[PDB]
PDB file of N, CA, C and O in Angstrom:
ATOM      1  N   UNK A   1       0.832  -1.498   0.029  1.00 15.03           N
ATOM      2  CA  UNK A   1       0.159   0.438  -0.179  1.00 15.03           C
ATOM      3  C   UNK A   1       1.090   1.419   0.075  1.00 15.03           C
ATOM      4  O   UNK A   1       0.081   2.335  -0.226  1.00 15.03           O
ATOM      5  N   UNK A   2       1.795   1.013   0.284  1.00 13.21           N
ATOM      6  CA  UNK A   2       2.828   2.192   0.615  1.00 13.21           C
ATOM      7  C   UNK A   2       4.457   1.416   0.681  1.00 13.21           C
ATOM      8  O   UNK A   2       4.801   0.477   1.047  1.00 13.21           O
ATOM      9  N   UNK A   3       5.303   2.446  -0.247  1.00 12.88           N
ATOM     10  CA  UNK A   3       6.593   1.728  -0.290  1.00 12.88           C
ATOM     11  C   UNK A   3       7.734   2.887  -0.553  1.00 12.88           C
ATOM     12  O   UNK A   3       7.374   4.037  -0.902  1.00 12.88           O
ATOM     13  N   UNK A   4       8.674   2.363   0.325  1.00  9.73           N
ATOM     14  CA  UNK A   4      10.109   3.603   0.263  1.00  9.73           C
ATOM     15  C   UNK A   4      11.299   3.149  -0.579  1.00  9.73           C
ATOM     16  O   UNK A   4      11.920   2.170   0.635  1.00  9.73           O
ATOM     17  N   UNK A   5      11.363   3.027  -1.425  1.00 11.24           N
ATOM     18  CA  UNK A   5      13.485   2.594  -2.079  1.00 11.24           C
ATOM     19  C   UNK A   5      13.785   3.506  -2.608  1.00 11.24           C
ATOM     20  O   UNK A   5      13.366   4.077  -2.924  1.00 11.24           O
ATOM     21  N   UNK A   6      15.062   3.587  -2.517  1.00 10.08           N
ATOM     22  CA  UNK A   6      16.229   3.831  -3.391  1.00 10.08           C
ATOM     23  C   UNK A   6      17.319   3.421  -3.873  1.00 10.08           C
ATOM     24  O   UNK A   6      17.392   2.437  -3.625  1.00 10.08           O
ATOM     25  N   UNK A   7      18.183   4.274  -5.252  1.00 10.31           N
ATOM     26  CA  UNK A   7      19.680   3.669  -5.290  1.00 10.31           C
ATOM     27  C   UNK A   7      19.863   3.262  -4.508  1.00 10.31           C
ATOM     28  O   UNK A   7      20.478   2.979  -2.997  1.00 10.31           O
ATOM     29  N   UNK A   8      20.479   1.609  -4.972  1.00 10.90           N
ATOM     30  CA  UNK A   8      21.519   0.783  -4.401  1.00 10.90           C
ATOM     31  C   UNK A   8      21.689  -0.634  -5.615  1.00 10.90           C
ATOM     32  O   UNK A   8      22.497  -0.297  -5.523  1.00 10.90           O
ATOM     33  N   UNK A   9      20.853  -1.471  -5.241  1.00 13.50           N
ATOM     34  CA  UNK A   9      21.167  -2.684  -5.882  1.00 13.50           C
ATOM     35  C   UNK A   9      19.876  -3.424  -6.091  1.00 13.50           C
ATOM     36  O   UNK A   9      18.773  -3.025  -4.989  1.00 13.50           O
ATOM     37  N   UNK A  10      19.510  -3.956  -7.329  1.00 14.63           N
ATOM     38  CA  UNK A  10      17.846  -4.615  -7.669  1.00 14.63           C
ATOM     39  C   UNK A  10      18.079  -5.389  -6.222  1.00 14.63           C
ATOM     40  O   UNK A  10      16.609  -5.674  -5.282  1.00 14.63           O
ATOM     41  N   UNK A  11      18.759  -6.039  -5.882  1.00 12.94           N
ATOM     42  CA  UNK A  11      18.412  -7.742  -4.915  1.00 12.94           C
ATOM     43  C   UNK A  11      18.665  -6.848  -3.726  1.00 12.94           C
ATOM     44  O   UNK A  11      17.266  -7.359  -2.740  1.00 12.94           O
ATOM     45  N   UNK A  12      19.301  -5.544  -3.263  1.00 11.02           N
ATOM     46  CA  UNK A  12      18.746  -5.006  -1.514  1.00 11.02           C
ATOM     47  C   UNK A  12      17.365  -4.245  -1.542  1.00 11.02           C
ATOM     48  O   UNK A  12      16.669  -4.741  -0.802  1.00 11.02           O
ATOM     49  N   UNK A  13      17.029  -4.217  -2.604  1.00 11.31           N
ATOM     50  CA  UNK A  13      15.114  -3.372  -3.001  1.00 11.31           C
ATOM     51  C   UNK A  13      14.495  -4.457  -2.368  1.00 11.31           C
ATOM     52  O   UNK A  13      13.760  -4.309  -2.126  1.00 11.31           O
ATOM     53  N   UNK A  14      14.216  -6.083  -3.610  1.00 13.74           N
ATOM     54  CA  UNK A  14      13.761  -7.099  -3.144  1.00 13.74           C
ATOM     55  C   UNK A  14      13.944  -7.463  -1.545  1.00 13.74           C
ATOM     56  O   UNK A  14      13.044  -7.705  -1.367  1.00 13.74           O
ATOM     57  N   UNK A  15      14.954  -7.197  -1.311  1.00 13.23           N
ATOM     58  CA  UNK A  15      15.306  -7.950   0.252  1.00 13.23           C
ATOM     59  C   UNK A  15      14.440  -6.300   1.017  1.00 13.23           C
ATOM     60  O   UNK A  15      13.936  -6.845   2.133  1.00 13.23           O
ATOM     61  N   UNK A  16      14.514  -5.248   0.889  1.00 16.10           N
ATOM     62  CA  UNK A  16      13.361  -4.557   1.664  1.00 16.10           C
ATOM     63  C   UNK A  16      12.105  -4.397   1.472  1.00 16.10           C
ATOM     64  O   UNK A  16      12.000  -4.499   2.706  1.00 16.10           O
ATOM     65  N   UNK A  17      12.017  -4.950   0.476  1.00 17.30           N
ATOM     66  CA  UNK A  17      10.166  -4.823   0.849  1.00 17.30           C
ATOM     67  C   UNK A  17       9.548  -6.543   1.258  1.00 17.30           C
ATOM     68  O   UNK A  17       8.989  -6.339   1.566  1.00 17.30           O
ATOM     69  N   UNK A  18      10.800  -7.007   1.637  1.00 18.47           N
ATOM     70  CA  UNK A  18      10.376  -8.240   2.141  1.00 18.47           C
ATOM     71  C   UNK A  18      10.101  -8.714   3.125  1.00 18.47           C
ATOM     72  O   UNK A  18       9.398  -8.732   4.123  1.00 18.47           O
ATOM     73  N   UNK A  19      10.943  -7.500   4.127  1.00 16.41           N
ATOM     74  CA  UNK A  19      10.838  -7.315   5.202  1.00 16.41           C
ATOM     75  C   UNK A  19       9.601  -6.245   5.659  1.00 16.41           C
ATOM     76  O   UNK A  19       9.183  -6.182   6.786  1.00 16.41           O
ATOM     77  N   UNK A  20       9.010  -5.762   3.918  1.00 19.77           N
ATOM     78  CA  UNK A  20       7.813  -4.514   4.898  1.00 19.77           C
ATOM     79  C   UNK A  20       6.410  -5.954   5.455  1.00 19.77           C
ATOM     80  O   UNK A  20       6.092  -5.709   6.209  1.00 19.77           O
ATOM     81  N   UNK A  21       6.155  -6.505   4.428  1.00 17.62           N
ATOM     82  CA  UNK A  21       4.965  -7.525   4.463  1.00 17.62           C
ATOM     83  C   UNK A  21       5.555  -8.842   5.007  1.00 17.62           C
ATOM     84  O   UNK A  21       4.412 -10.040   5.556  1.00 17.62           O
ATOM     85  N   UNK A  22       6.404  -9.116   5.488  1.00 16.74           N
ATOM     86  CA  UNK A  22       7.088 -10.580   5.387  1.00 16.74           C
ATOM     87  C   UNK A  22       6.735 -11.846   5.130  1.00 16.74           C
ATOM     88  O   UNK A  22       6.504 -12.998   5.796  1.00 16.74           O
ATOM     89  N   UNK A  23       6.646 -11.688   4.291  1.00 19.61           N
ATOM     90  CA  UNK A  23       6.750 -12.844   2.874  1.00 19.61           C
ATOM     91  C   UNK A  23       7.824 -13.651   2.261  1.00 19.61           C
ATOM     92  O   UNK A  23       9.276 -12.919   2.703  1.00 19.61           O
ATOM     93  N   UNK A  24       7.628 -14.456   2.162  1.00 16.80           N
ATOM     94  CA  UNK A  24       8.962 -15.782   1.163  1.00 16.80           C
ATOM     95  C   UNK A  24       9.275 -15.094   0.096  1.00 16.80           C
ATOM     96  O   UNK A  24       8.742 -15.733  -0.557  1.00 16.80           O
ATOM     97  N   UNK A  25      11.113 -14.451  -0.050  1.00 18.31           N
ATOM     98  CA  UNK A  25      11.569 -14.451  -1.108  1.00 18.31           C
ATOM     99  C   UNK A  25      11.965 -15.629  -1.738  1.00 18.31           C
ATOM    100  O   UNK A  25      13.130 -16.938  -1.068  1.00 18.31           O
ATOM    101  N   UNK A  26      12.319 -16.407  -2.817  1.00 14.01           N
ATOM    102  CA  UNK A  26      13.184 -16.940  -3.693  1.00 14.01           C
ATOM    103  C   UNK A  26      13.921 -16.320  -4.701  1.00 14.01           C
ATOM    104  O   UNK A  26      13.831 -16.518  -5.927  1.00 14.01           O
ATOM    105  N   UNK A  27      14.989 -16.185  -4.317  1.00 11.70           N
ATOM    106  CA  UNK A  27      16.213 -15.575  -5.329  1.00 11.70           C
ATOM    107  C   UNK A  27      17.312 -15.456  -4.955  1.00 11.70           C
ATOM    108  O   UNK A  27      17.859 -16.054  -3.804  1.00 11.70           O
ATOM    109  N   UNK A  28      19.049 -16.008  -5.883  1.00 10.91           N
ATOM    110  CA  UNK A  28      19.550 -16.563  -5.483  1.00 10.91           C
ATOM    111  C   UNK A  28      20.812 -15.056  -5.803  1.00 10.91           C
ATOM    112  O   UNK A  28      20.528 -14.172  -6.765  1.00 10.91           O
ATOM    113  N   UNK A  29      21.219 -14.689  -4.826  1.00 12.02           N
ATOM    114  CA  UNK A  29      22.483 -13.529  -4.867  1.00 12.02           C
ATOM    115  C   UNK A  29      23.585 -13.441  -6.082  1.00 12.02           C
ATOM    116  O   UNK A  29      24.947 -13.470  -5.630  1.00 12.02           O
ATOM    117  N   UNK A  30      23.142 -12.767  -7.050  1.00 15.93           N
ATOM    118  CA  UNK A  30      23.546 -14.025  -8.198  1.00 15.93           C
ATOM    119  C   UNK A  30      22.821 -12.914  -9.726  1.00 15.93           C
ATOM    120  O   UNK A  30      23.387 -12.018 -10.623  1.00 15.93           O
ATOM    121  N   UNK A  31      21.589 -13.359 -10.056  1.00 15.97           N
ATOM    122  CA  UNK A  31      21.094 -12.556 -11.013  1.00 15.97           C
ATOM    123  C   UNK A  31      20.592 -11.351 -10.353  1.00 15.97           C
ATOM    124  O   UNK A  31      20.430 -10.710 -11.379  1.00 15.97           O
ATOM    125  N   UNK A  32      20.508 -11.087  -9.213  1.00 17.39           N
ATOM    126  CA  UNK A  32      19.905  -9.763  -9.373  1.00 17.39           C
ATOM    127  C   UNK A  32      21.568  -9.642  -8.964  1.00 17.39           C
ATOM    128  O   UNK A  32      21.599  -8.152  -8.424  1.00 17.39           O
ATOM    129  N   UNK A  33      22.360  -9.993  -9.051  1.00 16.89           N
ATOM    130  CA  UNK A  33      23.831  -9.435  -8.531  1.00 16.89           C
ATOM    131  C   UNK A  33      24.489  -8.531  -9.552  1.00 16.89           C
ATOM    132  O   UNK A  33      24.703  -8.620 -10.656  1.00 16.89           O
ATOM    133  N   UNK A  34      24.386  -6.855  -9.321  1.00 16.11           N
ATOM    134  CA  UNK A  34      24.994  -5.712  -9.985  1.00 16.11           C
ATOM    135  C   UNK A  34      24.062  -4.606 -10.600  1.00 16.11           C
ATOM    136  O   UNK A  34      24.409  -3.340 -10.393  1.00 16.11           O
ATOM    137  N   UNK A  35      22.727  -5.372 -11.397  1.00 18.44           N
ATOM    138  CA  UNK A  35      21.823  -4.669 -11.427  1.00 18.44           C
ATOM    139  C   UNK A  35      21.595  -3.295 -10.744  1.00 18.44           C
ATOM    140  O   UNK A  35      20.982  -3.560  -9.504  1.00 18.44           O
ATOM    141  N   UNK A  36      20.950  -2.245 -10.871  1.00 19.83           N
ATOM    142  CA  UNK A  36      20.507  -1.007 -10.081  1.00 19.83           C
ATOM    143  C   UNK A  36      19.379  -0.666 -10.736  1.00 19.83           C
ATOM    144  O   UNK A  36      18.854  -0.512 -11.331  1.00 19.83           O
ATOM    145  N   UNK A  37      18.706   0.191  -9.354  1.00 16.75           N
ATOM    146  CA  UNK A  37      17.099   0.143  -9.478  1.00 16.75           C
ATOM    147  C   UNK A  37      17.504   1.643  -9.217  1.00 16.75           C
ATOM    148  O   UNK A  37      17.449   1.699  -7.640  1.00 16.75           O
ATOM    149  N   UNK A  38      16.829   2.678  -9.526  1.00 16.86           N
ATOM    150  CA  UNK A  38      17.078   4.502  -9.018  1.00 16.86           C
ATOM    151  C   UNK A  38      15.958   4.337  -7.965  1.00 16.86           C
ATOM    152  O   UNK A  38      15.455   5.763  -7.729  1.00 16.86           O
ATOM    153  N   UNK A  39      15.230   3.124  -7.378  1.00 20.03           N
ATOM    154  CA  UNK A  39      14.551   3.463  -6.327  1.00 20.03           C
ATOM    155  C   UNK A  39      12.764   3.498  -6.595  1.00 20.03           C
ATOM    156  O   UNK A  39      12.517   3.116  -7.934  1.00 20.03           O
ATOM    157  N   UNK A  40      12.020   3.393  -6.122  1.00 22.42           N
ATOM    158  CA  UNK A  40      10.756   3.523  -6.431  1.00 22.42           C
ATOM    159  C   UNK A  40      10.058   3.754  -4.722  1.00 22.42           C
ATOM    160  O   UNK A  40      10.247   3.853  -3.488  1.00 22.42           O
ATOM    161  N   UNK A  41       9.199   5.259  -5.454  1.00 20.04           N
ATOM    162  CA  UNK A  41       8.624   5.893  -3.956  1.00 20.04           C
ATOM    163  C   UNK A  41       6.922   6.342  -4.827  1.00 20.04           C
ATOM    164  O   UNK A  41       6.816   7.434  -5.047  1.00 20.04           O
ATOM    165  N   UNK A  42       5.892   5.438  -3.641  1.00 18.00           N
ATOM    166  CA  UNK A  42       5.076   6.133  -3.617  1.00 18.00           C
ATOM    167  C   UNK A  42       3.530   4.593  -3.412  1.00 18.00           C
ATOM    168  O   UNK A  42       3.975   3.870  -2.497  1.00 18.00           O
ATOM    169  N   UNK A  43       2.314   5.259  -3.788  1.00 16.54           N
ATOM    170  CA  UNK A  43       1.395   4.797  -3.193  1.00 16.54           C
ATOM    171  C   UNK A  43       1.082   2.922  -3.786  1.00 16.54           C
ATOM    172  O   UNK A  43       0.485   2.422  -4.795  1.00 16.54           O
ATOM    173  N   UNK A  44       2.339   2.066  -3.919  1.00 16.90           N
ATOM    174  CA  UNK A  44       2.423   1.222  -4.151  1.00 16.90           C
ATOM    175  C   UNK A  44       1.861  -0.348  -3.863  1.00 16.90           C
ATOM    176  O   UNK A  44       2.544  -0.615  -2.135  1.00 16.90           O
ATOM    177  N   UNK A  45       1.844  -1.438  -4.173  1.00 16.83           N
ATOM    178  CA  UNK A  45       1.320  -2.693  -3.128  1.00 16.83           C
ATOM    179  C   UNK A  45       2.399  -3.559  -3.882  1.00 16.83           C
ATOM    180  O   UNK A  45       3.162  -3.152  -4.563  1.00 16.83           O
ATOM    181  N   UNK A  46       1.584  -4.860  -3.468  1.00 17.29           N
ATOM    182  CA  UNK A  46       2.895  -5.701  -3.486  1.00 17.29           C
ATOM    183  C   UNK A  46       3.317  -5.435  -5.092  1.00 17.29           C
ATOM    184  O   UNK A  46       4.086  -5.539  -6.075  1.00 17.29           O
ATOM    185  N   UNK A  47       2.079  -6.359  -6.323  1.00 18.44           N
ATOM    186  CA  UNK A  47       2.524  -6.577  -8.033  1.00 18.44           C
ATOM    187  C   UNK A  47       2.996  -5.308  -8.024  1.00 18.44           C
ATOM    188  O   UNK A  47       3.973  -5.626  -8.955  1.00 18.44           O
ATOM    189  N   UNK A  48       2.422  -4.378  -7.935  1.00 22.57           N
ATOM    190  CA  UNK A  48       2.849  -3.179  -8.753  1.00 22.57           C
ATOM    191  C   UNK A  48       4.188  -2.409  -8.198  1.00 22.57           C
ATOM    192  O   UNK A  48       4.301  -1.981  -9.125  1.00 22.57           O
ATOM    193  N   UNK A  49       4.193  -2.846  -7.111  1.00 23.86           N
ATOM    194  CA  UNK A  49       5.815  -2.369  -6.601  1.00 23.86           C
ATOM    195  C   UNK A  49       6.903  -2.675  -7.687  1.00 23.86           C
ATOM    196  O   UNK A  49       7.713  -2.699  -7.870  1.00 23.86           O
ATOM    197  N   UNK A  50       6.303  -4.374  -7.800  1.00 22.77           N
ATOM    198  CA  UNK A  50       7.464  -5.436  -8.695  1.00 22.77           C
ATOM    199  C   UNK A  50       7.774  -4.652  -9.669  1.00 22.77           C
ATOM    200  O   UNK A  50       9.064  -4.632 -10.260  1.00 22.77           O
ATOM    201  N   UNK A  51       6.683  -4.051 -10.520  1.00 23.43           N
ATOM    202  CA  UNK A  51       6.173  -4.491 -12.010  1.00 23.43           C
ATOM    203  C   UNK A  51       7.500  -2.593 -11.872  1.00 23.43           C
ATOM    204  O   UNK A  51       7.932  -2.584 -13.252  1.00 23.43           O
ATOM    205  N   UNK A  52       7.231  -2.262 -11.582  1.00 24.36           N
ATOM    206  CA  UNK A  52       8.226  -0.535 -11.167  1.00 24.36           C
ATOM    207  C   UNK A  52       9.386  -1.015 -10.812  1.00 24.36           C
ATOM    208  O   UNK A  52      10.505  -0.126 -11.526  1.00 24.36           O
ATOM    209  N   UNK A  53       9.727  -1.671 -10.606  1.00 23.86           N
ATOM    210  CA  UNK A  53      11.283  -2.539  -9.931  1.00 23.86           C
ATOM    211  C   UNK A  53      12.224  -3.061 -10.908  1.00 23.86           C
ATOM    212  O   UNK A  53      13.355  -2.992 -11.099  1.00 23.86           O
ATOM    213  N   UNK A  54      11.382  -3.286 -12.000  1.00 20.28           N
ATOM    214  CA  UNK A  54      11.468  -4.129 -13.183  1.00 20.28           C
ATOM    215  C   UNK A  54      12.602  -2.650 -13.847  1.00 20.28           C
ATOM    216  O   UNK A  54      13.728  -2.694 -14.786  1.00 20.28           O
ATOM    217  N   UNK A  55      12.374  -1.903 -13.455  1.00 18.05           N
ATOM    218  CA  UNK A  55      13.132  -0.206 -14.097  1.00 18.05           C
ATOM    219  C   UNK A  55      14.457   0.017 -13.363  1.00 18.05           C
ATOM    220  O   UNK A  55      14.931   0.242 -12.724  1.00 18.05           O
ATOM    221  N   UNK A  56      15.393  -0.083 -14.623  1.00 21.48           N
ATOM    222  CA  UNK A  56      16.916  -0.760 -14.514  1.00 21.48           C
ATOM    223  C   UNK A  56      17.352  -2.050 -14.482  1.00 21.48           C
ATOM    224  O   UNK A  56      18.153  -2.339 -14.443  1.00 21.48           O
ATOM    225  N   UNK A  57      16.230  -2.609 -14.741  1.00 22.11           N
ATOM    226  CA  UNK A  57      16.541  -4.213 -15.010  1.00 22.11           C
ATOM    227  C   UNK A  57      16.271  -4.909 -15.556  1.00 22.11           C
ATOM    228  O   UNK A  57      15.440  -4.306 -16.339  1.00 22.11           O
ATOM    229  N   UNK A  58      16.421  -6.456 -15.983  1.00 24.13           N
ATOM    230  CA  UNK A  58      16.086  -7.005 -17.303  1.00 24.13           C
ATOM    231  C   UNK A  58      15.661  -8.397 -16.527  1.00 24.13           C
ATOM    232  O   UNK A  58      14.768  -9.077 -17.604  1.00 24.13           O
ATOM    233  N   UNK A  59      15.159  -8.327 -15.244  1.00 26.22           N
ATOM    234  CA  UNK A  59      14.927  -9.526 -14.639  1.00 26.22           C
ATOM    235  C   UNK A  59      13.402  -9.219 -14.774  1.00 26.22           C
ATOM    236  O   UNK A  59      12.686  -8.506 -14.691  1.00 26.22           O
ATOM    237  N   UNK A  60      12.491 -10.454 -14.155  1.00 23.42           N
ATOM    238  CA  UNK A  60      10.978 -10.483 -13.147  1.00 23.42           C
ATOM    239  C   UNK A  60      10.691 -11.087 -12.837  1.00 23.42           C
ATOM    240  O   UNK A  60      11.220 -12.503 -12.148  1.00 23.42           O
ATOM    241  N   UNK A  61      10.478  -9.889 -11.000  1.00 19.66           N
ATOM    242  CA  UNK A  61      10.151 -10.924 -10.573  1.00 19.66           C
ATOM    243  C   UNK A  61       9.251 -11.216  -9.869  1.00 19.66           C
ATOM    244  O   UNK A  61       7.939 -10.541 -10.324  1.00 19.66           O
ATOM    245  N   UNK A  62       8.631 -12.793 -10.055  1.00 16.45           N
ATOM    246  CA  UNK A  62       7.605 -13.145 -10.159  1.00 16.45           C
ATOM    247  C   UNK A  62       6.888 -13.969  -8.818  1.00 16.45           C
ATOM    248  O   UNK A  62       7.702 -14.960  -8.189  1.00 16.45           O
ATOM    249  N   UNK A  63       5.111 -13.515  -8.423  1.00 15.49           N
ATOM    250  CA  UNK A  63       5.159 -14.565  -7.116  1.00 15.49           C
ATOM    251  C   UNK A  63       4.631 -15.248  -7.305  1.00 15.49           C
ATOM    252  O   UNK A  63       4.563 -15.928  -8.322  1.00 15.49           O
ATOM    253  N   UNK A  64       5.737 -16.193  -6.188  1.00 14.31           N
ATOM    254  CA  UNK A  64       5.232 -17.740  -6.515  1.00 14.31           C
ATOM    255  C   UNK A  64       4.282 -18.088  -5.819  1.00 14.31           C
ATOM    256  O   UNK A  64       3.723 -18.847  -6.098  1.00 14.31           O
ATOM    257  N   UNK A  65       3.802 -17.626  -4.555  1.00 12.13           N
ATOM    258  CA  UNK A  65       2.342 -17.612  -4.337  1.00 12.13           C
ATOM    259  C   UNK A  65       1.641 -17.756  -3.069  1.00 12.13           C
ATOM    260  O   UNK A  65       2.699 -17.141  -2.356  1.00 12.13           O
ATOM    261  N   UNK A  66       0.803 -17.193  -2.694  1.00 13.87           N
ATOM    262  CA  UNK A  66      -0.089 -16.270  -2.179  1.00 13.87           C
ATOM    263  C   UNK A  66       0.560 -15.011  -1.702  1.00 13.87           C
ATOM    264  O   UNK A  66      -0.139 -14.147  -2.407  1.00 13.87           O
ATOM    265  N   UNK A  67       1.396 -14.501  -1.082  1.00 16.81           N
ATOM    266  CA  UNK A  67       2.060 -13.552  -0.799  1.00 16.81           C
ATOM    267  C   UNK A  67       3.531 -13.618  -1.928  1.00 16.81           C
ATOM    268  O   UNK A  67       4.689 -12.586  -0.851  1.00 16.81           O
ATOM    269  N   UNK A  68       3.874 -14.518  -1.860  1.00 16.50           N
ATOM    270  CA  UNK A  68       5.782 -14.095  -2.051  1.00 16.50           C
ATOM    271  C   UNK A  68       6.197 -14.733  -3.439  1.00 16.50           C
ATOM    272  O   UNK A  68       4.906 -14.820  -4.141  1.00 16.50           O
ATOM    273  N   UNK A  69       7.229 -15.191  -3.395  1.00 16.77           N
ATOM    274  CA  UNK A  69       8.288 -14.638  -4.109  1.00 16.77           C
ATOM    275  C   UNK A  69       9.333 -15.643  -5.203  1.00 16.77           C
ATOM    276  O   UNK A  69      10.012 -16.093  -4.085  1.00 16.77           O
ATOM    277  N   UNK A  70       9.700 -15.261  -6.559  1.00 17.41           N
ATOM    278  CA  UNK A  70      10.509 -16.400  -6.686  1.00 17.41           C
ATOM    279  C   UNK A  70      11.525 -15.713  -7.834  1.00 17.41           C
ATOM    280  O   UNK A  70      10.170 -14.635  -8.459  1.00 17.41           O
ATOM    281  N   UNK A  71      12.427 -15.666  -8.108  1.00 17.40           N
ATOM    282  CA  UNK A  71      12.868 -14.749  -9.244  1.00 17.40           C
ATOM    283  C   UNK A  71      13.363 -15.544 -10.487  1.00 17.40           C
ATOM    284  O   UNK A  71      14.123 -16.122 -10.884  1.00 17.40           O
ATOM    285  N   UNK A  72      12.246 -14.977 -11.208  1.00 21.02           N
ATOM    286  CA  UNK A  72      12.139 -15.838 -12.569  1.00 21.02           C
ATOM    287  C   UNK A  72      13.256 -15.012 -13.927  1.00 21.02           C
ATOM    288  O   UNK A  72      13.025 -14.168 -14.138  1.00 21.02           O
ATOM    289  N   UNK A  73      14.301 -15.928 -14.292  1.00 21.80           N
ATOM    290  CA  UNK A  73      15.092 -15.983 -15.230  1.00 21.80           C
ATOM    291  C   UNK A  73      14.765 -15.268 -16.240  1.00 21.80           C
ATOM    292  O   UNK A  73      14.443 -16.738 -17.246  1.00 21.80           O
ATOM    293  N   UNK A  74      14.800 -14.332 -17.172  1.00 22.68           N
ATOM    294  CA  UNK A  74      14.291 -14.012 -18.040  1.00 22.68           C
ATOM    295  C   UNK A  74      14.668 -12.788 -19.254  1.00 22.68           C
ATOM    296  O   UNK A  74      13.532 -12.123 -19.758  1.00 22.68           O
ATOM    297  N   UNK A  75      16.077 -12.627 -19.202  1.00 23.27           N
ATOM    298  CA  UNK A  75      16.232 -11.078 -19.340  1.00 23.27           C
ATOM    299  C   UNK A  75      16.392 -11.003 -20.529  1.00 23.27           C
ATOM    300  O   UNK A  75      15.390 -10.546 -21.275  1.00 23.27           O
ATOM    301  N   UNK A  76      17.371 -11.482 -21.719  1.00 21.90           N
ATOM    302  CA  UNK A  76      17.279 -11.935 -22.847  1.00 21.90           C
ATOM    303  C   UNK A  76      18.215 -13.197 -23.421  1.00 21.90           C
ATOM    304  O   UNK A  76      18.973 -13.068 -23.506  1.00 21.90           O
ATOM    305  N   UNK A  77      17.557 -14.198 -22.597  1.00 22.25           N
ATOM    306  CA  UNK A  77      18.109 -15.387 -23.052  1.00 22.25           C
ATOM    307  C   UNK A  77      17.561 -15.966 -24.127  1.00 22.25           C
ATOM    308  O   UNK A  77      18.258 -17.009 -24.185  1.00 22.25           O
ATOM    309  N   UNK A  78      16.383 -15.792 -24.942  1.00 26.95           N
ATOM    310  CA  UNK A  78      16.458 -15.884 -26.090  1.00 26.95           C
ATOM    311  C   UNK A  78      15.402 -14.909 -26.561  1.00 26.95           C
ATOM    312  O   UNK A  78      14.613 -14.905 -25.510  1.00 26.95           O
ATOM    313  N   UNK A  79      15.688 -14.654 -27.892  1.00 28.82           N
ATOM    314  CA  UNK A  79      14.413 -13.666 -28.693  1.00 28.82           C
ATOM    315  C   UNK A  79      12.945 -15.001 -29.431  1.00 28.82           C
ATOM    316  O   UNK A  79      12.420 -13.921 -30.282  1.00 28.82           O
ATOM    317  N   UNK A  80      13.147 -15.953 -28.114  1.00 27.11           N
ATOM    318  CA  UNK A  80      11.662 -17.069 -28.563  1.00 27.11           C
ATOM    319  C   UNK A  80      10.912 -16.562 -28.183  1.00 27.11           C
ATOM    320  O   UNK A  80      10.587 -17.471 -27.226  1.00 27.11           O
TER     321      UNK A  80
END
């Protein structure tokens, strides 16, 4: 419903959001390793926050189930 994020790295961004609602993340410190996200500050909920977090990345944050997430790798792994 409300989110506060800022420059750091996508990994730490998702990490920070996780602490908010206390859900389970499935992500390895490698796919998110390096890419930066200029942050996010608005009235954002779960799904809508992730979609914006894609700004600056080529990854896809995919809700695992219920309220949890998993990092689905599909940057440019094939234009098929």
